[PDB]
Amino acid sequence: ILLEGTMNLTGEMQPLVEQLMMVKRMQHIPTPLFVLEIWKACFVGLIESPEGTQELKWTAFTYLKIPQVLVKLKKYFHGEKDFTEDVNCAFEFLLKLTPLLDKADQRCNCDCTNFLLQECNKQGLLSEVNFASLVGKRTADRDPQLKIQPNPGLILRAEPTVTNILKTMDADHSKSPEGLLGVLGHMLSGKSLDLLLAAAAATGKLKSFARKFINLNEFTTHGSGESTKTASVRALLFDISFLMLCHVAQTYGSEVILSESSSGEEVPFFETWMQTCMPEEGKILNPDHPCFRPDSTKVESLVALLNNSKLVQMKWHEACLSISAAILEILNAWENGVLAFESIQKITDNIKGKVCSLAVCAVAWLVAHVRMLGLDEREKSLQMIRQLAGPLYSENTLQFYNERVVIMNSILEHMCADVLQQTATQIKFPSTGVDTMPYWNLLPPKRPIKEVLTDIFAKVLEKGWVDSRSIHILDTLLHMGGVYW
Amino acid sequence: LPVSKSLETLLDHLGGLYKFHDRPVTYLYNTLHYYEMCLRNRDHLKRKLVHAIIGSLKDNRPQGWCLSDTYLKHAMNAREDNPWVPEDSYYCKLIGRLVDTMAGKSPGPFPNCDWRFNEFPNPAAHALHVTCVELMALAVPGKDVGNALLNVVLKSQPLVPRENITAWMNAIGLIITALPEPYWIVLHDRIVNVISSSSLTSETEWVGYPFRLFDFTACHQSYSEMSCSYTLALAHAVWHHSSIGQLSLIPKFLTEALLPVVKTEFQLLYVYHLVGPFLQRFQQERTRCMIEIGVAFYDMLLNVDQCSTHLNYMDPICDFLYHMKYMFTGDSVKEQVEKIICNLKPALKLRLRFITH
C-alpha cells in the first residue's frame, strides 16, 4: 500500500483494488485485520517521509482510499459478514493506538481535529448507523490528553481539511467546457497555492482539468484582435495555463499527456509538452527531429531580440522555434563574440513580462547543449541570468501575477536542470523558497552498488514497514542495474 | 525552625570558603531520607533554605552552567508562580544534555579546567545536581515530582524524537537512581494502578496478544507503541541501572499490590516481564528474595487458575516456569510450590507434572 501510494497517486481507478483482492485470495487475512492494516498504512504515511508537497499527495491518497474501501465493501465480501461489524471492531482496535494519533497531531499541528473530520467523512461515505458514538467515545479519550507550546502559532484553518472540503467545489469549478470567459476564475488560482492541483490529484478532476486546459490552449489562437487589454489578459491566461500544465507534468506527467492525447483527430503542440523534462535526455534529438524550421518566421525571433524594447501582438510560434534564438545566443555570447554584454540585454528583453514559455525553452535547450564538454558553459550563465530577478517591473508588465508566475518558473527550473546542476558546479541558490524536493538519487558516489542489503534489507527486516522513502531509492536501483542480479 | 535564620548568615560570610569541593548529593540526600513526611510545613522555611543551599552552589566560577541559569532567572522573582509546570519541558532540556552526552556538541564549553579535580570522569554526574532541591519547598514532592519525571514517556514531548527513546529512558533511570525513596516508589504504584488494569479483564480488544505488545523495539515502527508497553520499558529503564539493592523493594511491592489486581493471563505475562529478567541479581546477592519472587510467581499462577474459563497460552507459561526452575531456583522451593501445585486444574496438573522433581 505504501508502494502504490508513493509511485502512482493518481491514475489508480482500481488496479490497487484488484491487487488487494488477489493478495487476499493468495493469503489468509481476516477482513477486520485487513481493513486495520490498510488504515494503519494510511495513518503511518504523511508523517515519516514527506515534509512538503508530497504531504498533500499522501493525504489525497488517504482520502482516496475511501471510495476504494467502499468498492471493497461492495464487491469483495458477499453473504458472509457484509461489513456488519468489521469497520466497527477495526476502529475500536486502532483507537488503542493513541500514541500514533498523538504523533500525528504533533506533526500536523491540526491532525487531532483533522482526524475527527476525516472520521465524519468516512461515516458519510461508509456505514454510519451508530459508529458516531464510537467516534465520540474515542474523542473522549483523545481530547483530554491535549485539553512553550505549539498551539499558539497554529490557530488558522487546517490545510488538509480545507483542501479536502473545497475539492467538492473544485471538481465542479465552473462546469463550463468552453472559453472566452473571464480570467478571474483563474486569477483566484494565482493567489492560492497548488491546493487546487492537490485536490485534482484525487483522480476525480485531473483528467477533466487537463482536458479543459488543453482545449483552452488549442482554442486560444488569439484570432485577430487589437484590444491591448484583452490581448494581454488572454496572453496571461495562456501563460498561466501552460505553467499549470508544466507543473502537472513535473508532478505526475504521463497521466496528463495521456489524458490529452488519448482520442480525437487533431495534433496540438504536444512536442514541447512531451520533450521538456523526463527520465530521458533526447538532447540532440531536438536539433535533429523537431528542427523543421522553414524560412517563415525564422528571423521573427531574431528581429524580436533585435528590437524588443515583445508583447506587441499575440503570437506563440517561437516556442517551437526558439532554436534560432539559442543559436544566436551561443554564437554571440562566447562562440564567436558578436555581443559581449549585449547578450544579457537581449536576454532581459526576451525575459519580458507575460512570457514564461521562453524560459522553459531556454532551460530545455541548455539541457540539450550540456551534452558538450562543458568548456564553454555559456548556457549555464545564460540560464542563471534568466532565473534572476531581472524583470523588476522594467517594462510595462500588465500581469499583476508576477509573484505566482515567478514561483512557478522557479519550481519548474528546479525540477529540470537536475543534470546541469549536477554535472557542473552547484548553483548560487536562486531558490529562496522553503523546502525543495528531497527525493533524489542519494547514491553515495564513492561507494559501489553492493550496499542495498546491509543498508536497506537488514533495517527493513528489523523495522515494521518498507521505509517508503528508501523505496524511491530502490526504484532508482531497479531501472539502473539489471533485474537478474 | 529559627536555626534557619542562623544558617543563612553563615555562608553569607563564609560562602567563598567552599571553593575546594562540590558534592551536595551525598551531603543532602541523607537530610531527607524520612523527613519529607514531616518536613512539609517546615518546608516553607526550606523555601528560604533552598535559596541558601543554591547559594553554596553559587560559590563556583568555572563557567560550567549555561542552561540551569534559566531556572535561576525564573526562580528569583515570585518563586511561587513560575516554576511549577514548565519544569517538565525544562526537565526534557535537562535530560537533553544527558542524551547530549554521547555524540552531540555538549563536550564543548561545558567541561573545562581541567577534567582533573572537578569530579569529571563522566559529565552524567552533573545531572543529579539540582533534581531534588528543584521544588522541595512546596507540596510538589511526594506525587507531583514522580508524575513530572514520568510525563516524558506516556506523553509525546515535542523535542522528544522517536529514534533514540532508548537512551532517553536510560538517562531517566540514571537520574531516578539518585532520588529519594518516595519519588521513585510512587512510580511503581502509578504503573500498577491503572496501566496494568485499564479494563483488561472483560474484553480489552483483539490486540490482547501479549507477546507483540509487551515486547519492546516495536517502537522502531510508527505503530505498535501502546502507552502501557512504553511504561514497561520505563520500569526496565530504572531496573537497567538501579540493580544493586533497590530490588529488595519489589517482593513486598509484589506480595500485596500485585495480588488483587490480576484476573486474566496477559496481566500475568505483563507482571512476569516486569519482574522476570532480573533473577540473576537475586541469585548473586539477594538470595533470600528469589524464593519470595518464586512464590509470588506461583501465587499469580494460582490466581489466574482460579479465575479463568480456560488457559489460552499454556505452553508459554509452561516453558517459562521450566526455564525459571532449571536455571534459577535450583532445587530449593520444590516443597512449598507443591502445596500450591497440587490444587491446580487437571490439564495444568498434567502440564506441570514434572515439576515434582
PDB file of N, CA and C in Angstrom, chain B residues 10-61:
ATOM      1  N   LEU B  10      25.664  32.277  57.951  1.00  0.00           N
ATOM      2  CA  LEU B  10      26.979  31.642  57.964  1.00  0.00           C
ATOM      3  C   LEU B  10      27.641  31.682  56.592  1.00  0.00           C
ATOM      4  N   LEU B  11      27.015  31.047  55.600  1.00  0.00           N
ATOM      5  CA  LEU B  11      27.571  31.085  54.250  1.00  0.00           C
ATOM      6  C   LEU B  11      27.669  32.517  53.741  1.00  0.00           C
ATOM      7  N   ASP B  12      26.724  33.376  54.133  1.00  0.00           N
ATOM      8  CA  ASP B  12      26.728  34.776  53.720  1.00  0.00           C
ATOM      9  C   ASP B  12      28.030  35.461  54.116  1.00  0.00           C
ATOM     10  N   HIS B  13      28.757  34.864  55.055  1.00  0.00           N
ATOM     11  CA  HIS B  13      30.092  35.313  55.413  1.00  0.00           C
ATOM     12  C   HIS B  13      31.181  34.309  55.070  1.00  0.00           C
ATOM     13  N   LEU B  14      30.844  33.030  54.907  1.00  0.00           N
ATOM     14  CA  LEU B  14      31.828  32.000  54.595  1.00  0.00           C
ATOM     15  C   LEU B  14      31.484  31.193  53.348  1.00  0.00           C
ATOM     16  N   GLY B  15      30.651  31.729  52.460  1.00  0.00           N
ATOM     17  CA  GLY B  15      30.334  31.047  51.219  1.00  0.00           C
ATOM     18  C   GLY B  15      31.551  30.802  50.354  1.00  0.00           C
ATOM     19  N   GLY B  16      32.340  31.856  50.132  1.00  0.00           N
ATOM     20  CA  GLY B  16      33.521  31.735  49.289  1.00  0.00           C
ATOM     21  C   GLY B  16      34.508  30.691  49.775  1.00  0.00           C
ATOM     22  N   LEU B  17      34.432  30.332  51.058  1.00  0.00           N
ATOM     23  CA  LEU B  17      35.321  29.318  51.615  1.00  0.00           C
ATOM     24  C   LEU B  17      35.070  27.937  51.017  1.00  0.00           C
ATOM     25  N   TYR B  18      33.967  27.752  50.290  1.00  0.00           N
ATOM     26  CA  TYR B  18      33.612  26.436  49.778  1.00  0.00           C
ATOM     27  C   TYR B  18      34.357  26.062  48.507  1.00  0.00           C
ATOM     28  N   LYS B  19      35.284  26.896  48.044  1.00  0.00           N
ATOM     29  CA  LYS B  19      35.873  26.696  46.727  1.00  0.00           C
ATOM     30  C   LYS B  19      36.946  25.616  46.724  1.00  0.00           C
ATOM     31  N   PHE B  20      36.611  24.425  47.220  1.00  0.00           N
ATOM     32  CA  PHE B  20      37.538  23.300  47.172  1.00  0.00           C
ATOM     33  C   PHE B  20      36.897  21.969  46.809  1.00  0.00           C
ATOM     34  N   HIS B  21      35.569  21.846  46.853  1.00  0.00           N
ATOM     35  CA  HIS B  21      34.880  20.603  46.531  1.00  0.00           C
ATOM     36  C   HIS B  21      33.386  20.858  46.394  1.00  0.00           C
ATOM     37  N   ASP B  22      32.716  20.107  45.521  1.00  0.00           N
ATOM     38  CA  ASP B  22      31.282  20.286  45.334  1.00  0.00           C
ATOM     39  C   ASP B  22      30.580  18.956  45.092  1.00  0.00           C
ATOM     40  N   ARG B  23      30.089  18.335  46.162  1.00  0.00           N
ATOM     41  CA  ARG B  23      29.326  17.092  46.085  1.00  0.00           C
ATOM     42  C   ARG B  23      28.104  17.181  46.995  1.00  0.00           C
ATOM     43  N   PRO B  24      27.125  18.015  46.639  1.00  0.00           N
ATOM     44  CA  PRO B  24      25.965  18.197  47.522  1.00  0.00           C
ATOM     45  C   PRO B  24      25.014  17.017  47.529  1.00  0.00           C
ATOM     46  N   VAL B  25      25.141  16.085  46.587  1.00  0.00           N
ATOM     47  CA  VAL B  25      24.229  14.949  46.513  1.00  0.00           C
ATOM     48  C   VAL B  25      24.361  14.078  47.756  1.00  0.00           C
ATOM     49  N   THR B  26      25.580  13.636  48.066  1.00  0.00           N
ATOM     50  CA  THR B  26      25.782  12.776  49.227  1.00  0.00           C
ATOM     51  C   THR B  26      25.656  13.574  50.517  1.00  0.00           C
ATOM     52  N   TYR B  27      25.771  14.890  50.420  1.00  0.00           N
ATOM     53  CA  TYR B  27      25.688  15.806  51.548  1.00  0.00           C
ATOM     54  C   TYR B  27      24.259  16.257  51.844  1.00  0.00           C
ATOM     55  N   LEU B  28      23.305  15.947  50.963  1.00  0.00           N
ATOM     56  CA  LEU B  28      21.933  16.422  51.115  1.00  0.00           C
ATOM     57  C   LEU B  28      20.938  15.269  51.076  1.00  0.00           C
ATOM     58  N   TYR B  29      21.251  14.169  50.390  1.00  0.00           N
ATOM     59  CA  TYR B  29      20.343  13.035  50.270  1.00  0.00           C
ATOM     60  C   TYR B  29      19.923  12.496  51.632  1.00  0.00           C
ATOM     61  N   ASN B  30      20.880  12.378  52.554  1.00  0.00           N
ATOM     62  CA  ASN B  30      20.576  11.841  53.875  1.00  0.00           C
ATOM     63  C   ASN B  30      19.679  12.776  54.673  1.00  0.00           C
ATOM     64  N   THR B  31      19.666  14.062  54.329  1.00  0.00           N
ATOM     65  CA  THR B  31      18.878  15.041  55.067  1.00  0.00           C
ATOM     66  C   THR B  31      17.383  14.940  54.795  1.00  0.00           C
ATOM     67  N   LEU B  32      16.951  14.052  53.902  1.00  0.00           N
ATOM     68  CA  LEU B  32      15.538  13.887  53.586  1.00  0.00           C
ATOM     69  C   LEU B  32      15.145  12.424  53.418  1.00  0.00           C
ATOM     70  N   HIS B  33      15.845  11.503  54.079  1.00  0.00           N
ATOM     71  CA  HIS B  33      15.543  10.084  53.940  1.00  0.00           C
ATOM     72  C   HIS B  33      14.177   9.759  54.534  1.00  0.00           C
ATOM     73  N   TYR B  34      13.821  10.421  55.642  1.00  0.00           N
ATOM     74  CA  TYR B  34      12.486  10.247  56.203  1.00  0.00           C
ATOM     75  C   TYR B  34      11.900  11.559  56.722  1.00  0.00           C
ATOM     76  N   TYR B  35      12.506  12.704  56.400  1.00  0.00           N
ATOM     77  CA  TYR B  35      11.997  13.974  56.901  1.00  0.00           C
ATOM     78  C   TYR B  35      10.831  14.501  56.081  1.00  0.00           C
ATOM     79  N   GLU B  36      10.716  14.089  54.816  1.00  0.00           N
ATOM     80  CA  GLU B  36       9.697  14.633  53.927  1.00  0.00           C
ATOM     81  C   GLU B  36       8.304  14.510  54.534  1.00  0.00           C
ATOM     82  N   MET B  37       7.927  13.292  54.941  1.00  0.00           N
ATOM     83  CA  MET B  37       6.624  13.035  55.550  1.00  0.00           C
ATOM     84  C   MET B  37       6.296  13.985  56.694  1.00  0.00           C
ATOM     85  N   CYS B  38       7.295  14.638  57.284  1.00  0.00           N
ATOM     86  CA  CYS B  38       7.056  15.612  58.339  1.00  0.00           C
ATOM     87  C   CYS B  38       7.707  16.964  58.090  1.00  0.00           C
ATOM     88  N   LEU B  39       8.349  17.190  56.941  1.00  0.00           N
ATOM     89  CA  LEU B  39       9.035  18.462  56.732  1.00  0.00           C
ATOM     90  C   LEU B  39       8.145  19.480  56.032  1.00  0.00           C
ATOM     91  N   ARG B  40       7.006  19.035  55.493  1.00  0.00           N
ATOM     92  CA  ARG B  40       6.166  19.843  54.610  1.00  0.00           C
ATOM     93  C   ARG B  40       5.958  21.262  55.132  1.00  0.00           C
ATOM     94  N   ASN B  41       5.426  21.402  56.347  1.00  0.00           N
ATOM     95  CA  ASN B  41       5.226  22.727  56.925  1.00  0.00           C
ATOM     96  C   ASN B  41       6.556  23.452  57.078  1.00  0.00           C
ATOM     97  N   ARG B  42       7.528  22.802  57.722  1.00  0.00           N
ATOM     98  CA  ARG B  42       8.864  23.374  57.809  1.00  0.00           C
ATOM     99  C   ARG B  42       9.482  23.567  56.432  1.00  0.00           C
ATOM    100  N   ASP B  43       9.020  22.815  55.428  1.00  0.00           N
ATOM    101  CA  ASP B  43       9.485  23.021  54.064  1.00  0.00           C
ATOM    102  C   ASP B  43       9.213  24.433  53.568  1.00  0.00           C
ATOM    103  N   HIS B  44       8.212  25.119  54.131  1.00  0.00           N
ATOM    104  CA  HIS B  44       8.030  26.533  53.831  1.00  0.00           C
ATOM    105  C   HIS B  44       9.283  27.338  54.141  1.00  0.00           C
ATOM    106  N   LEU B  45       9.886  27.133  55.313  1.00  0.00           N
ATOM    107  CA  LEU B  45      11.181  27.723  55.615  1.00  0.00           C
ATOM    108  C   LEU B  45      12.288  27.171  54.729  1.00  0.00           C
ATOM    109  N   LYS B  46      12.150  25.933  54.248  1.00  0.00           N
ATOM    110  CA  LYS B  46      13.073  25.428  53.240  1.00  0.00           C
ATOM    111  C   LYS B  46      12.982  26.257  51.966  1.00  0.00           C
ATOM    112  N   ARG B  47      11.827  26.885  51.731  1.00  0.00           N
ATOM    113  CA  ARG B  47      11.647  27.809  50.618  1.00  0.00           C
ATOM    114  C   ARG B  47      12.688  28.919  50.684  1.00  0.00           C
ATOM    115  N   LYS B  48      13.149  29.230  51.894  1.00  0.00           N
ATOM    116  CA  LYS B  48      14.307  30.093  52.078  1.00  0.00           C
ATOM    117  C   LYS B  48      15.621  29.330  52.012  1.00  0.00           C
ATOM    118  N   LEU B  49      15.700  28.174  52.674  1.00  0.00           N
ATOM    119  CA  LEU B  49      16.923  27.387  52.745  1.00  0.00           C
ATOM    120  C   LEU B  49      17.442  26.951  51.383  1.00  0.00           C
ATOM    121  N   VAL B  50      16.560  26.709  50.413  1.00  0.00           N
ATOM    122  CA  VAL B  50      16.999  26.362  49.068  1.00  0.00           C
ATOM    123  C   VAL B  50      17.802  27.530  48.512  1.00  0.00           C
ATOM    124  N   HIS B  51      17.298  28.752  48.703  1.00  0.00           N
ATOM    125  CA  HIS B  51      17.993  29.944  48.233  1.00  0.00           C
ATOM    126  C   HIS B  51      19.294  30.131  49.000  1.00  0.00           C
ATOM    127  N   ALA B  52      19.453  29.389  50.095  1.00  0.00           N
ATOM    128  CA  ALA B  52      20.726  29.329  50.797  1.00  0.00           C
ATOM    129  C   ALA B  52      21.566  28.190  50.236  1.00  0.00           C
ATOM    130  N   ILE B  53      20.943  27.030  50.020  1.00  0.00           N
ATOM    131  CA  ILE B  53      21.697  25.870  49.553  1.00  0.00           C
ATOM    132  C   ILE B  53      22.274  26.127  48.168  1.00  0.00           C
ATOM    133  N   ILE B  54      21.464  26.671  47.260  1.00  0.00           N
ATOM    134  CA  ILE B  54      21.939  27.022  45.926  1.00  0.00           C
ATOM    135  C   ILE B  54      22.997  28.111  46.049  1.00  0.00           C
ATOM    136  N   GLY B  55      22.932  28.889  47.132  1.00  0.00           N
ATOM    137  CA  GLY B  55      23.984  29.859  47.393  1.00  0.00           C
ATOM    138  C   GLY B  55      25.341  29.202  47.532  1.00  0.00           C
ATOM    139  N   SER B  56      25.377  28.032  48.175  1.00  0.00           N
ATOM    140  CA  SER B  56      26.610  27.255  48.227  1.00  0.00           C
ATOM    141  C   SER B  56      27.047  26.854  46.824  1.00  0.00           C
ATOM    142  N   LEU B  57      26.081  26.518  45.965  1.00  0.00           N
ATOM    143  CA  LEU B  57      26.387  26.279  44.562  1.00  0.00           C
ATOM    144  C   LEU B  57      26.905  27.537  43.880  1.00  0.00           C
ATOM    145  N   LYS B  58      26.482  28.715  44.345  1.00  0.00           N
ATOM    146  CA  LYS B  58      26.931  29.965  43.746  1.00  0.00           C
ATOM    147  C   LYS B  58      28.427  30.188  43.919  1.00  0.00           C
ATOM    148  N   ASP B  59      29.052  29.536  44.898  1.00  0.00           N
ATOM    149  CA  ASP B  59      30.486  29.688  45.107  1.00  0.00           C
ATOM    150  C   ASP B  59      31.272  28.815  44.137  1.00  0.00           C
ATOM    151  N   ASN B  60      31.173  29.115  42.845  1.00  0.00           N
ATOM    152  CA  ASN B  60      31.905  28.371  41.824  1.00  0.00           C
ATOM    153  C   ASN B  60      31.895  29.205  40.552  1.00  0.00           C
ATOM    154  N   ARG B  61      33.080  29.508  40.020  1.00  0.00           N
ATOM    155  CA  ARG B  61      33.221  30.280  38.787  1.00  0.00           C
ATOM    156  C   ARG B  61      34.102  29.540  37.782  1.00  0.00           C
TER     157      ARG B  61
END
